[model samples]
Target: DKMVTCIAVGLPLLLISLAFAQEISIGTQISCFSPSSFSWRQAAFVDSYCWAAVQQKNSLQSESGNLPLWLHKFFPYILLLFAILLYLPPLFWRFAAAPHICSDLKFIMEELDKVYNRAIKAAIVEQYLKTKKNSNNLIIKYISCRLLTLIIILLACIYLGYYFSLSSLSDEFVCSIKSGILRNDSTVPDQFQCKLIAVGIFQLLSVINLVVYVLLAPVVVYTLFVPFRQKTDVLKVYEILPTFDVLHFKSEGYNDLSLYNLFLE
Candidate 1:
């Protein structure tokens, strides 16, 4: 499950970085072949003007039919969003769950260590007893951690599923070259068919990410079932902590030997 989460988070990040590198290596995201009569500058202007106004066309009203251009335009950012979503469950554990467990264990260990001394035996047991009495509360904390993880994974899977469903709509569009200075140029074609670069790559990566998450969904569900399967396997600190149950009898100058003998029987 941990490995799945790591892959889920890292894969998108890796793809996003590669996407940026592709953008840098290849200057234009969309390409159009201008009319033969158009000057070089006019061709450049057509490309630039059409790219800028691509969003406005929205539907078949432009060269690219109503297919969603926003998805292709923000592919990298969407990948970034995916990485963040996949990362959130672990972040919740680290910040909210881990500290409570660590702190409780540390306090238990420190109190147990003080039990060997006759002076602090009663105090140590009292502290230990308090923790055991309140251990029921920790069950809520543990369950909450598991539930939070489950919820986040489920939410992420839903998003990935949505992305996969809509991704096929459109990456190629007909762009208008008639805007700006070319509006009066009768020599220029009214529309140019343009394709978004790297969209196919993005689609491939999205599919991979989606498949991994779909497989991971059951694993996360299994994780949520774990606390129930092992509910009887609850933590019993006294099993590891030296018994202060016998320490009440040692009146003064308690030694390590006495502590050793108590456990030996």
Candidate 2:
């Protein structure tokens, strides 16, 4: 489960870094087709304008048309969100659950090692056993964390599936270059075809992300069921009492062999 979580969380971060690296290395995320007569600056302006307006597709304004362009535009940020969400389950355990369990374990271990005084040790053990017997909240917490993790994993899988389904759609769009300075310019075409350069790479990263999450989904579900399968074993864990044997007995210069024998008996 930990391995799967690591992959689920880490793969997206790795891919996000790769996507950013690709963008940085390329230096431009988009390009636009300009008229043959247009200057280099005008072409650059067309590219910039289209990239900015790409998220505002005309169809998106209508109720039926949800823009997948935002998904493409914020692909890296989406992966970052995935990484943060995938990380939260373990973080919850670390901060909220682990400390309580660790405290109990430490108390029990300290009680076990308080063997110098037999009566004191026995009293501590008795109290520890009582406490252990009464403690169900920690187990509940454990189960909660696992179940929460599984839910997050399932949600992430759904999101990845949605992203993948929309990934194949065009990242490029027809931009109305006739806006701004070209507003009524007779020579300017009605629209220019602009293509996002990084989208192909983004699609590849999305595929990788989706595949890993899909594979990790089953592992998360199995982990969620683990507490149930081990419920009986966990409850019976502290049932066995600790045994003590004394090789020598000396207290206040009076050795009590009879008392030790009685304890063994």
Candidate 3:
């Protein structure tokens, strides 16, 4: 369970840091081919200018029926967004649910290892199960938290899949140098090929992101009904009498107690 949460959260965050580092180590994210006739600074301007314009959805890029300019600049941040969102359920469980469950957990922990009074422990635990009138609400609270995470994870998987397909457009694009002083300048060619290496790296990472989360999603679906699969018979350890079985069956939120008790295990 903990491993699932860690991989779900940590995997994306780990990739985010790697993608972020790619930005740092690769000194020129874009490499341009300027006209041979221009001065060094003119070609330098071409490199800097097109790199800025590469990610923008301006009329030029869009009108040309060219490749996608989608999601490149915000790549790591989007993964960063995914990382924090995957983290939220754990925080919610710790803050909102774990405290309420902790007392029960501690009692059970020591109850198993204590002065070894099985009858008192069983009686107290039986009473403890009835302490809350509407404990089922807590079950929905946790389920909905994960349900939200499930939706986010699903969307991220879809997005990465779509983006991975889009990344197939090779990095070289014809960048227009028709702006600023270059706009009216007759000597300069109106456009030249500019290259961005960032997209290739992103292509690989996007696929990695897609498949890991795709695999992660099914396990999350399993967790949604883990309590349903688990029978509430652990205190059967102390069942000299069969009094507890009916309480488990007859109580209003007794099913909910299974998940709560699972929080202990």
Please tell me which predicted candidate would have the highest lDDT against the true structure: 3
Error of 3 at 155 (Å): 1.1
- Tens-digit lDDT track for model 2 on 191-223? 676667776666666567667767776776665
Worst-scoring 10-residue span by lDDT in model 3:
237-246
How far in Å is the alpha carbon of 206 misplaced in model 1?
Answer: 1.9
CA deviation > 4 Å runs, candidate 2 = 1-26, 60-71, 111-127, 231-265
Measured over all alpha carbons after superposition, the RMSD of each candidate to the real structure, in angstroms, is 8.4, 8.9, 8.6
TM-score, per-candidate, Cα-based: 0.63, 0.69, 0.72
**Candidate 2, poorest ten consecutive residues by summed lDDT:** 241-250
Compose the digit string of candidate 3's lDDT tens values, residues 164-217: 556555455677756654556656776767767677667777767788778878
Score each candidate by Cα lDDT: 0.56, 0.58, 0.61
Per-residue lDDT of model 1, residues 75-132, tens digit only? 5666567556656655775677566545655564555466555445556356666656
What is the C-alpha local distance difference test score of candidate 1? 0.56
Candidate 1 TM-score over all chains jointly: 0.63
Error of 2 at 64 (Å): 12
